[PDB]
Amino acid sequence: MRIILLGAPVAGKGTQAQFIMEKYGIPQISTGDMLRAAVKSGSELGKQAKDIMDAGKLVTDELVIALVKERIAQEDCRNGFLLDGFPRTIPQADAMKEAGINVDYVLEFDVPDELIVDRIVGRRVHAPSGRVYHVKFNPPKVEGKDDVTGEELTTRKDDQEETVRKRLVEYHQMTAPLIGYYSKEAEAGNTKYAKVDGTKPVAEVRADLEKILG
Ligand SMILES: Nc1ncnc2c1ncn2[C@@H]1O[C@H](COP(=O)(O)OP(=O)(O)OP(=O)(O)OP(=O)(O)OP(=O)(O)OC[C@H]2O[C@@H](n3cnc4c(N)ncnc43)[C@H](O)[C@@H]2O)[C@@H](O)[C@H]1O
Numbered sequence: 001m002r003i004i005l006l007g008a009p010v011a012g013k014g015t016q017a018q019f020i021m022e023k024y025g026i027p028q029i030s031t032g033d034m035l036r037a038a039v040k041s042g043s044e045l046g047k048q049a050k051d052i053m054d055a056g057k058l059v060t061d062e063l064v065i066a067l068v069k070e071r072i073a074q075e076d077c078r079n080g081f082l083l084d085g086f087p088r089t090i091p092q093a094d095a096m097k098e099a100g101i102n103v104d105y106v107l108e109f110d111v112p113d114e115l116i117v118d119r120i121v122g123r124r125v126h127a128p129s130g131r132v133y134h135v136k137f138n139p140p141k142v143e144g145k146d147d148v149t150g151e152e153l154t155t156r157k158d159d160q161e162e163t164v165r166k167r168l169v170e171y172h173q174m175t176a177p178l179i180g181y182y183s184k185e186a187e188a189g190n191t192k193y194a195k196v197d198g199t200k201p202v203a204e205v206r207a208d209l210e211k212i213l214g
Pocket of ligand 1: 064
């Protein structure tokens with residue numbers, strides 16, 4: 001099963017990708033996790049994104065498509081995988097198409113723009129794994145620590161109010177056209193398209209997703 005998760009900044013894609021991965025066994029391929037990991041380890045494919053992500057801007061399609069094709073080539077992606085935050089532009093969606101990467105579901109996370117800033121202020125991460133928390137809406141079991149490793153939780157560098165306003169603008173100019181793109185894909189018969197209300201509680205969104213997927 002191959003799934004794309006499409007949606008605004010902090011719509012809860014990452015949170016739901018952890019559930020889909022543990023319950024359907026397909027690996028989560030998050031381009032922001034991979035890009036933050038590259039920037040941190042000084043990896044030649046990807047360490048260039050540092051200043052771009054910092055600024056709230058989209059990294060160049062040629063860079064991110066390179067990253068995705070290497071990852072998708074690993075033997076764990078043979079029985080499906082889950083794309084979280086990829087594609088992000090029509091170039092990146094075209095490129096998966098030319099490459100013969102067709103997906104089964106495109107799931108759009110709808111959240112109003114007004115909710116974005118307060119999700120940013122209480123988000124905390126386990127950077128080694130892409131586990132994400134919210135101090136109010138989905139807190140760790142012990143305050144400040146990752147549930148699985150007990151390691152200390154951090155804030156993302158780019159979770160500032162003005163960085164997220166820029167992320168939103170770029171989302172509206174470049175990514176949001178992908179809703180029309182895969183709706184058109186779905187009409188053609190190439191994929192299934194489903195919309196979920198991202199303002200619901202985490203457990204509620206999760207259960208909506210179990211309904212669509214099996
Ligand atoms: N393909 C690409 N092309 C180019 N550049 C790229 C790229 N990919 C990455 N980059 C770059 O890297 C940068 C960062 O992008 P990136 O990290 O890739 O962005 P994203 O995939 O859109 O996801 P976000 O991190 O914004 O949030 P999310 O929807 O996964 O929600 P989350 O579950 O964390 O949670 C949101 C918060 O609220 C929470 N929450 C989750 N669900 C709920 C709920 N039900 N109710 C309330 N709170 C909730 C969480 O606890 C958390 O605290 C980009 O700007 C760009 O520079």
